[PDB]
Ligand binder design. Sequence first.
Ligand SMILES: CO[C@@H](C(=O)NCCOc1c(C)cc(C)cc1C)[C@H](O)[C@@H](O)[C@H](O)/C=C/C(C)(C)C
Ligand SMILES: [Mn+2]
Ligand SMILES: [Mn+2]
Length: 284
Amino acid sequence: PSRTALSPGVLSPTRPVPNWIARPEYVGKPAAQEGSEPWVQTPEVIEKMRVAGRIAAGALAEAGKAVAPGVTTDELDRIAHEYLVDNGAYPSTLGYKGFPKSCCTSLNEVICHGIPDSTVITDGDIVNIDVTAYIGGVHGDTNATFPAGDVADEHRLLVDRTREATMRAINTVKPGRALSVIGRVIESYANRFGYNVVRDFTGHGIGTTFHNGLVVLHYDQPAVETIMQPGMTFTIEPMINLGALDYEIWDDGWTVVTKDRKWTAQFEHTLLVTDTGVEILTCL
Ligand SMILES: CO[C@@H](C(=O)NCCOc1c(C)cc(C)cc1C)[C@H](O)[C@@H](O)[C@H](O)/C=C/C(C)(C)C
Ligand SMILES: [Mn+2]
Ligand SMILES: [Mn+2]
């Protein structure tokens, strides 16, 4: 048997960031200035995005190494926060539209945007950690779902097949291809197992802004005409559900849960379209 439905916990105090680490402009503001930026980045921006991406990947991997029964989601946030700040990076989530922590922790039925808190991870859980770094005036965004203890076969396979859907989508990225191939590959692969691909939350372009206005759909919609071109940077971040797509948001305004409480898994990388294919910017 696995645990029952989750409920929210208490948050730790706000974690500070040294003043010499520049903040994204949206920290301390009610909204973010994003969504109208170019989709192809300059070579100087891309080089800085490699640095941001590798730092985010390191924070993700260090917090992921700590996932085990008995650990709180707050303790994962502390690890990610300190990794970023020791690397001179600001955690992009912290202060984005008032989000109170440095990463998102989404267990089990939480589709995305779970808030690190007193919640204790237990055996059988699947834990998504989502970390973004802001450094050099650019962002790097990545997430992964990590098993805690011995996970039930249905949940283990959900995580492994979500990871594989993500990698197959990444491996389609090439200049001249339609962006819509990403969602076609994810949803074709998920539908083999009878999983449902979340639609309402998407991948996105990323650069000097966190969400630049480019949308990357994870389901199949061949009417989108956008093509991949060298220098475009975006995330692929599919959420895949064992149950129905219907969802609720907690009173915290962030945490998104499946209405049937069936579990869901996600992986994310920030990608660069190169002249021949793709480069993952959020690798160690
Ligand atoms: C699944 O979650 C992704 C997500 O919301 N996509 C939808 C992005 O919608 C847009 C689009 C499509 C355009 C603009 C201009 C702005 C937004 C938020 C995130 O990008 C996630 O990867 C990120 O780590 C977390 C960010 C906050 C918790 C701080 C929000
Ligand atoms: Mn993310
Ligand atoms: Mn993202």
